[PDB]
Amino acid sequence: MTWRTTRTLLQPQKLDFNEFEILTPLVEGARIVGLGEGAHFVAEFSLARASLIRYLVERHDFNAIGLECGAIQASRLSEYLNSTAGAHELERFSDPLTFSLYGSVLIWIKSYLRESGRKLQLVGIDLPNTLNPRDDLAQLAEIIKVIDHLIKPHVDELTHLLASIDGQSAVISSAKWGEMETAQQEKAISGVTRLKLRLASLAPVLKKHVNSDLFRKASDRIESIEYTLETLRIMRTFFDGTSLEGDTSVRDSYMAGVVDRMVRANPDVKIILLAHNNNLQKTPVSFSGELTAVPMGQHLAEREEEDYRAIAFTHLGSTVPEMQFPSPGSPLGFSVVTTPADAIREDSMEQYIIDACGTEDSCLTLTDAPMKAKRMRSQSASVETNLSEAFDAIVCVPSAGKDGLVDL
């Protein structure tokens, strides 16, 4: 009664909506539903995401999708979705990491929206997934020029101070960050704090009608830059030295903040969050070099509205695409290589799926029932937690092959 074999999950065009009825109670009253992935860059996880987007959109009226990219990165993706009059390939509207993480789903979404006539809001809930603050600072400088020109030299100094942060991924940008002198780093961090406090102090004036929503956009840009610099500082310790336990919660708390603000600002929004299992999880995550981090989902599970749900995706394959770091010569500082996935053990969610659904097709299970499962695959490893508290449901596909458009 709490599990279901789904034969159509990997076939979004031939979906049998009866197979997802098990989710209808948990999705009622939800305004935020996360669709996970146990590993990035997996073809089957993009397929399952497209199917569950169909279910949430067509049967529960979800109307927005949030991605692990920045707000400006996402506006370009929105241009892609809405375009048609010319050569409008996704490569023209996306950066390399965004393309590999979401390209397959994004190409499908555009067709789906055109053919179905439906409409969805795209939202970047993240920092720039490059950790390059250039776009944010450039938009801030244009806004500030209009609404608070007195502080425009300060924004332009910041732009110059941070011009060398131009990577296409966190590992590249963080390496460029570590090449700056400590005093220039702290001067930039202090510069952003000065700007943040000035803008908040002037809010009653800058919210005047002639400025439209420019105060809000400036405030969002500054927040994005502030957390980008702190995440660059952390990413540096997270390999090159003294990473403090819990520090990797900072980026995920930014994401939780963007989602929370967006939902309470727009009360009709019902958003589907496309993020990793480790980000959607509602309990503390222990993984790789982090003894314990607080995930985005644990913040969102705090909402008094109790309207967040998290669906983890896992798989029964013997291998999984993994990120290989370091990877000298690779354009983004890492590569994606097929590697053996973590062994399935008796107290694993994977074994429960095998015991419940079998191994023939995919499986969908709720987590609120006594069970032996305490660990679940994540990348080529596993995380251990209380899975009834950590996720609301689990989606498990038969295999996890590298997505064919991923070029890393």
Author numbering: 11 to 418
From the article:
One of these resistance mechanisms entails the enzymatic cleavage of the macrolides’ macrolactone ring by erythromycin esterases (Eres).
However, there is a notable difference in a loop between residues 295 and 303. To examine the binding of erythromycin to EreC, flexible docking (Dock v6.9) was used to build a model of the EreCClosed-erythromycin complex. The rationale behind utilizing the closed conformation of EreC for the docking experiment was because of the higher resolution structure, providing greater confidence in the position of the amino acid conformers. Upon examining the docked structure, we were able to see that erythromycin sits snugly in the active site of EreCClosed with the interfacial surface area of 633 Å2, as calculated by PDBePISA.
